């Protein structure tokens, strides 16, 4: 006999309900991938036997967002088309696990200074029953995870 407010505190969070917000816009995405912290390890070892292991230089964060093609809207493409030589508008991406008809966040990830590389066009295919989907890849720094 678990109460419905006990499940909100004790139970794990399902992945499939999430909100992605790219800068000021919020746009519906099919899937989000990557988005993990990582560290190189530095190892010193000298002759008397002691072995030092340290966290080292952080690694660059690479995120992949996947989204279907909608008939009026290309604003994933216009972001990657605006790249002149090294100047692009970087913007913050927030992923947020929500409840059904999300008025309440459960977890929140924050990405800083994300800019697009490698927008992937759909694979046109005459014998396929799929939607035209696009992956955009983002390079960024500082994934942080926020409670609620």
């Amino acid at each position: 006999s678990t109460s419905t407010s006990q499940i909100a505190v004790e139970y794990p969070i399902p992945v499939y309900r999430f909100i992605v917000s790219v800068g000021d816009e919020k746009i519906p995405f099919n899937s989000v991938s990557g988005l993990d912290i990582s560290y190189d390890t530095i190892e010193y070892r000298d002759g008397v036997g002691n072995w030092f292991k340290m966290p080292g230089q952080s690694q660059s964060t690479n995120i992949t967002l996947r989204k279907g093609v909608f008939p009026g809207k290309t604003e994933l493409f216009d972001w990657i088309n605006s790249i002149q030589l090294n100047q692009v508008e970087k913007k913050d991406i927030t992923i947020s696990l929500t409840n059904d008809a999300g008025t309440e966040l459960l977890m929140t990830w924050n990405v800083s200074n994300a800019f697009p590389t490698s927008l992937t066009s759909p694979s046109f295919d005459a014998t396929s029953n799929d939607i035209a989907v696009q992956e955009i890849t983002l390079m960024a720094d500082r994934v942080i995870m926020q409670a609620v």
């Binding site: 917000s21 929500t98 999300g102």
Partner: protein, 352 residues
């Protein structure tokens, strides 16, 4: 000026001075202009993008004008674009202009307007002049009585003089350019003191160290004095507030700059639905900005969680009553760096 009929080249000979342009994101001054100035009109600000832009508005550079020698000293030190508002309509135009940060009196009485527009909410900092007369260590606490005790104001004493200028230059106009030159090279958090003046400036009155000790304490008057190895240089960072919170102009100008940048990030949250997915986007937008400012060294803290904190919430900051009214309340704290002002040397005769 020059009339061009054939393609050719033209080898006109004329003496006109040209100053290089600078772009400053953080310091946009407004020069108070006296009445009996025939070039600018009442009740509109004239944006002057460069010294050449100013030299098109007036025909000749005039040595006798207080406005002319103050604007040339401003652009020689590295100032960006500025506005020119007349002093009697000055209280109407500064609220219209959005990105104005500095308020500069170029030898003008703005003490009436500074009390009514410099508020804790508004981002205006107001540098103005010291008294033109050569003052004393003796009657020193009466000269600090003439100025208000607001934390948003700094007073720089000696009216500078130059070989090109016939009259003495007000020192606040050269300090609008020093503010823009400091913040571009080292940041807003760095104090504008011990910076040399790039124009051909030197103080009208040489200032003893014992006199500067009188004025630095209560309603502090920063002073521009000459050093033989540095030339002329600025030697103060203190505001007119003696309280330990807002004693220095790098701390007051950092908080003015941070809250203006947070103003722009809260501009996108305007007229969005007032629920939790907005508040976690408002907090994330501020937390990115204060982190990248802490990474530049702007905020003082060894640990990142010591430099700042942001708090939004329905239990924390705003009532259910205040949410239905339409309000959204955020709490931001910062930890600025203070400048080292005194250095005490102890010389010992025996080495041990």
């Amino acid at each position: 000026t020059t009339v061009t009929s054939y393609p050719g080249v033209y080898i006109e000979e004329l003496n006109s001075l040209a100053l290089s342009v600078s772009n400053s994101a953080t310091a946009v001054p407004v020069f108070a202009v006296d009445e009996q100035n025939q070039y600018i009109s009442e009740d509109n600000a004239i944006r002057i993008n460069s010294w050449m832009d100013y030299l098109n508005l007036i025909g000749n550079f005039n040595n006798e004008d207080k406005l002319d020698v103050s604007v040339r000293a401003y652009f020689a030190n590295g100032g960006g674009y500025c506005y020119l508002v007349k002093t009697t309509s000055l209280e109407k135009i500064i609220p219209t202009l959005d990105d104005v940060t500095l308020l500069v009196a170029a030898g003008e009485d703005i003490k009436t307007t500074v009390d009514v527009l410099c508020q804790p909410g508004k981002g205006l900092f107001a540098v103005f002049d010291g008294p033109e007369t050569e003052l004393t260590i003796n009657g020193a606490e009466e000269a600090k009585q003439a100025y208000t005790a607001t934390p948003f104001a700094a007073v720089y004493y000696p009216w500078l003089k130059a070989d090109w200028a016939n009259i003495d230059i007000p020192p606040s106009a050269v300090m609008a350019g020093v503010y823009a030159s400091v913040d571009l090279s080292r940041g807003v958090w760095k104090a504008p003191a011990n910076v040399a003046l790039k124009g051909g400036l030197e103080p009208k009155f040489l200032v003893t160290d014992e006199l500067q000790g009188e004025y630095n304490t209560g309603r502090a008057i920063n002073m521009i004095r000459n050093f033989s190895n540095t030339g002329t240089t600025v030697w103060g960072a203190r505001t007119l507030e003696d309280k330990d919170n807002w004693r220095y102009v790098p701390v007051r100008r950092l908080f003015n700059s941070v809250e203006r940048d947070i103003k722009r990030a809260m501009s996108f949250a305007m007229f969005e639905p007032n629920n939790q997915p907005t508040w976690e986007r408002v907090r994330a937008a501020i937390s990115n900005y204060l982190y990248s400012l802490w990474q530049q060294g702007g905020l003082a803290g060894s640990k990142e969680e010591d430099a700042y904190f942001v708090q939004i919430g329905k239990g924390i900051t705003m009532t259910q009553e205040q949410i239905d009214a339409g309000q959204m309340i955020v709490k931001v704290g910062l930890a600025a760096v203070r400048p080292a002002e005194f250095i005490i040397l102890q010389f010992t005769q025996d080495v041990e």
